[PDB]
Design a protein around this ligand. Structure first.
Ligand SMILES: Nc1ncc2c(n1)-c1c([nH]c3ccc(Br)cc13)CCC2
Ligand SMILES: Nc1ncc2c(n1)-c1c([nH]c3ccc(Br)cc13)CCC2
Lengths: 334, 335
């Protein structure tokens, strides 16, 4: 059972619901660990589309036949490159992340599928062609928070708070659902064309809680409990979020300007990088970051808790007033 | 040599094949292992074999020193293939991007430094984090596979001509102890004028001195592969003839008469010599029979087969049929 729904889904591309896609994705992750045999001339083609804007024809959905990528690479995710694409029948434009079966984790779809938060990039479906999983999602037009930070050097306190807060909304939505993101950083939050809306993008590091099986993201954003080899929970994301905040404010990641790699040792041994908080910051801003960067996950605030403090700090600075893009602010020197 | 490796690591250098080969071995070993926290700045290392691909300050990074342009060129066994231009030299070539976790050193060991006109030349390979970028000559006449499809099936002389060249390359590899492992139309690349063909994608290659042969497309697999026996270069010879049948009929060998998996059928049934078109020349048909002998031991070598194929081409009048000629309907399946 569900072994039966799986049998019914296998071999075909169907319009359907998240649960169906999730069930299939588990089979993809299992068999990608399974070194395979001689390939059929016609690649297997199976999956589930979650929106009518992406339409299988005769239970197929194949690159170059039913849809296609546009010239230039959009970005690069943890386990696959991301491109712009078009459904050839409906004209719909979205994004696709192409992942090798052998490195495909079901959580990549399990952690966002069917989710309906504005702070989480919507999943349109996923389709397998042979040893490739194509993951379809909303195309966003304002680039990543990571790109923004690099082109502006650093963000103003208010902008930084604004994005941090929106991200924490998404994190709260995830955590209440036993979902941990695992790679919270500027490069993985995506922006609207007018910079007003931010959303979490890449769940390649996600884990679906009940731990022990957390695959670490970027070392500078790693919490002490990860680096110590201890069991991990949602608080990991809270710490990452505050590492991202420091990055937005200073234009450089925490630890980098003071230590050399690997930073794993230093993260564990050293005190939290609260010393990297800009003195120019508002009292409520600084305290929020401190509580988010508590080395003991247990005393560390939740995403919801941190979100509140951050909304209040934003108030304290006068709300969001700094202009969308704007003028370059030189990042902090080492 | 553990010292040569240490000296190359962390840097992108202009250098020689052997150096690239040694580094590539570390990549295949390192693709093994759920990893640790990633450094913020991706590792960047590799070796370029031509000055037309030029690193700056020992770096070579996508979007900085080079970039892809236009639409996907193709899809190899372990990675997609694109056009790219080096931002320093303006040089255009092709790049195949392969995930570290599925990267086989043979992908480079089997073609690096090789100087046959029948084997697509390797320009180098560069790693960025969990990605291996394989650079190679960009060819302008598409793949033999694309050709066969848009023409339905090919005229006998064209087919012989391409078969012969592939066999030249195959002979070249085998004499160097290299089995390609995925010989098929999709893995032969064509000049703009259709005159030159060369073997590409060595994702299935193995470097002889089996048990370690990763099978390609089931329809091109030899009986000894499919039985799980020890494998040698003769595997490529069988595949080549499967490819020949494909060019002639516009469809792979077994597909029209059996259902998958074909593993069983290839083993049990006689060789697909019956799929040879009767209208073919005596020498053509016989060549294919010899390439498709079920015991690899009695099966002709790539060199032997090449002579027959060249002779067959003669008997038919040499290469005369036009390039991008007229559609010829591929053989239909039975009801
Ligand atoms: N869907 C989508 N729209 C826009 C972007 C991206 N994705 C995007 C960028 N880097 C990425 C890394 C992982 C993922 Br899943 C998406 C992106 C680059 C930012 C632009
Ligand atoms: N270097 C190069 N130039 C042109 C092409 C190709 N490669 C090409 C195609 N399919 C492929 C599959 C594997 C590889 Br390695 C190359 C190609 C499609 C043919 C076009």
């Amino acid at each position: 059972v569900e072994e039966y729904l799986v049998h019914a889904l296998q071999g075909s591309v169907s319009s359907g619901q998240a649960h169906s896609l999730t069930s299939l994705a588990k089979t993809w992750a299992a068999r990608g660990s399974r070194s395979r045999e001689p390939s059929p001339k016609t690649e297997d083609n199976e999956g589930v589309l979650l929106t009518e804007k992406l339409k299988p024809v005769d239970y197929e959905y194949r690159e170059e036949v039913h849809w296609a990528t546009h010239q230039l690479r959009l970005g690069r995710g943890s386990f696959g490159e991301v491109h712009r694409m078009e459904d050839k029948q409906t004209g719909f434009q979205c994004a696709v992340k192409k992942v090798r079966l052998e490195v495909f984790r079901a959580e990549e779809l399990m952690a966002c599928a069917g989710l309906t938060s504005p702070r989480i990039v919507p999943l349109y479906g996923a389709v397998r062609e042979g040893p490739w999983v194509n993951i379809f999602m909303e195309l966003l037009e304002g680039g990543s928070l990571g790109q923004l930070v690099k082109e502006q050097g650093c963000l103003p306190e208010d902008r930084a708070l604004y994005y941090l807060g929106q991200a924490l909304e998404g994190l709260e939505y995830l955590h209440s659902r036993r979902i941990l993101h695992g790679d919270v950083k500027a490069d993985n939050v995506l922006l609207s064309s007018d910079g007003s809306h931010a959303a979490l993008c890449d769940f390649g590091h996600a884990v679906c809680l009940q731990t022990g099986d957390y695959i670490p993201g970027t070392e500078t954003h790693m919490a002490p409990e990860v680096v110590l080899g201890r069991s991990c929970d949602a608080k990991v994301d809270v710490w990452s979020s505050c590492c991202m905040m420091l990055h937005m404010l200073n234009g450089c990641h925490p630890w980098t300007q003071f230590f050399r790699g690997p930073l794993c040792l230093k993260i564990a041994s050293e005190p939290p990088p609260v010393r990297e908080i800009p003195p120019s910051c508002a009292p409520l801003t600084a305290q929020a970051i401190q509580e988010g960067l508590r080395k003991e996950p247990i005393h560390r605030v939740s995403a919801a808790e941190l979100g509140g403090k951050v909304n209040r700090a934003l108030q304290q600075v006068g709300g969001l007033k700094s202009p969308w893009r704007g003028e370059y602010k030189e990042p902090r020197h080492p």
